[PDB]
C-alpha cells in the first residue's frame, strides 16, 4: 500500500472525478529538475492506488499534477485551470500523506490528510 | 454500513477532527420540527460509523450538527463558529451519502460525496 | 457601510451568486430563541450592502441563512442544500466581519474575513 | 486599475495574508517558456494592486505563484506547500479576473472571482 494517496472529487456534480490523469514528480536535489515518478489514472471512486512504493518515498519536494483541463473537456465542458499542480514537502517519511483535489470548472482546493 | 457517513478534517493542522460530537436530525414533514436521530462522536480517523440504519434511512430533509465550538475549546482554542449545521435533501435513498466537514478556526467547507 | 458584509460566489459557473435571499438573525440572549433582524437579496455582484447598522451590531451570536435551494431552482437546477445557515460569534464589535459563501450545487464554503 | 486582482486570506487566523510575495507569469505561446510579468507583495488587506496593465492583458495562460513557505516561515511556522502556483486561461480580455488564495498551513483553495 502506497504512503501517498489522493482522491479527486467533482464538486459541481458531487461525484468522484473518475478517469483523470495524475502525474507524480520529485524534485532532483542537485539540478532543479522534476523527475517523473509515476503517471496514474483515477479509478471510478476517484482514487489512484500504487502512486509510489514505501521504498522510493524519500524526504523531499514532490509534485502532483492533475490534468483538470482534459478531465473537464472529456465531460464536454471548459475549465478555468488547464491543469493543477500541488507541490508539497515531505520530511517525516513514516506518515501517510493524503493529497486530494476538490474541483469544479471555476475553483479547486486541497488539504493535507492522513 | 450506514448509508450516511462523514469525515472531519482539521484543515489548520492537517489531521482528522477526532472526538468531535455530531448530531443527526431529520425534519418532521407535518410540523416542521427537527428530531434527533442519532448522536455520535468522531473517532481517531475523524469518521463516525453507524449514523443511521438502512431501514431508518427514508427520503426527507436531514441535518448534521457538528460541535465545532466544543471541539476547538477542548484543543484550547476558540472557534468563530459555535457549531455548524449542514442541512441536506435526500430523495434517493439507494445511494451512499458522505457529508464531511473541513474546518479551521475561521473557515469551513463541505462537499457531497459517495 | 454595514460592519457586516457578505459575498456569494457561484463556484460552479464562475460568476456572482446574484439575487440570492439572505436572512440575518441574532440569538436572543435571554431565552436562546432566534430573532430576525432583516432580509436582503444579493445584487449582481453577489453582495448585500447595508445588512445592519453600526448602532445595532452588538455583541452576540448571529446567523445568516442563505436560500441556496431557491437560488439554484431559479437557475433551473437542484441544490443538495435547501438552505445554508452560518452561525457565528461576535465579541469585538469594532472589527469588520466579512462572512461570504462560496457555492456549487453539491458543496459550499465560508471563511471569516476582515 | 488592474484587470487581474488577487486576495490572500489566512484561514488559520481569519486575517489577510499580508506581506506575501506574489509573482505573475505568462506562458509564451511559441516556445514553452514562462515569462515573469510582475512581482508584488500583498498589502495589509492581503491584496496586490497593479498586477498588470489593461494594454498588457492579452489572452493566454497565466500563472500566479504565491510564496506560501516564506510567508509561514516569517510567522515562525512550517507550511506543507513551499509555494502555490495557480495556472489559468484568459480568453475574454474585457472581463475582470480575481484569483484569490485561501490558505492555512496544511490546506488551500482558490475560486475564480469576477
Curated annotation (Swiss-Prot), chains A, B, C, D:
Any one GO cellular component localisation term in the record: peroxisome
Enzyme class: hydrolase
Domain of life per record: Eukaryota
Catalytic reactions of this protein: 5-hydroxyisourate + H2O = 5-hydroxy-2-oxo-4-ureido-2,5-dihydro-1H-imidazole-5-carboxylate + H(+)
Chief location bin: other
Transmembrane segments: none
Entry keyword set: Hydrolase, Peroxisome, Purine metabolism
Subcellular location: Peroxisome
Enzyme Commission number(s): 3.5.2.17
Residues the record lists as binding substrate: 7, 47, 111
Effect after changing residue 45 to A: Reduces activity by 50%
Disulfide feature: none
Leftover remarks: HIU hydrolysis also occurs spontaneously, but more slowly.
Family to which the UniProt record says this protein belongs: Belongs to the transthyretin family. 5-hydroxyisourate hydrolase subfamily.
Summary of the function given for this chain in its UniProt record: Catalyzes the hydrolysis of 5-hydroxyisourate (HIU) to 2-oxo-4-hydroxy-4-carboxy-5-ureidoimidazoline (OHCU).
Assembly and binders: Homotetramer.
Full protein name: 5-hydroxyisourate hydrolase
Protein's organism: Danio rerio (Zebrafish)
The organism's taxonomic lineage, starting at the top: Eukaryota, Metazoa, Chordata, Craniata, Vertebrata
Gene transcribed to yield this protein: urah
Amino acid at each position: 500500500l502506497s504512503p501517498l494517496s489522493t482522491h479527486v472529487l467533482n464538486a459541481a456534480q458531487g461525484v468522484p472525478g473518475a478517469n483523470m490523469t495524475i502525474v507524480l514528480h520529485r524534485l532532483d536535489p542537485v539540478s532543479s529538475a522534476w523527475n517523473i515518478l509515476t503517471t496514474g489514472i483515477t479509478n471510478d471512486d476517484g482514487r489512484c492506488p500504487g502512486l509510489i512504493t514505501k521504498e522510493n518515498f524519500i524526504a523531499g519536494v514532490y509534485k502532483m499534477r492533475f490534468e483538470t483541463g482534459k478531465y473537464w473537456d472529456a465531460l464536454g465542458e471548459t475549465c478555468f485551470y488547464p491543469y493543477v499542480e500541488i507541490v508539497f514537502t515531505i520530511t517525516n517519511t513514516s506518515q501517510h500523506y493524503h493529497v486530494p483535489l476538490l474541483l469544479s470548472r471555476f475553483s479547486y482546493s486541497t488539504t493535507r490528510g492522513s
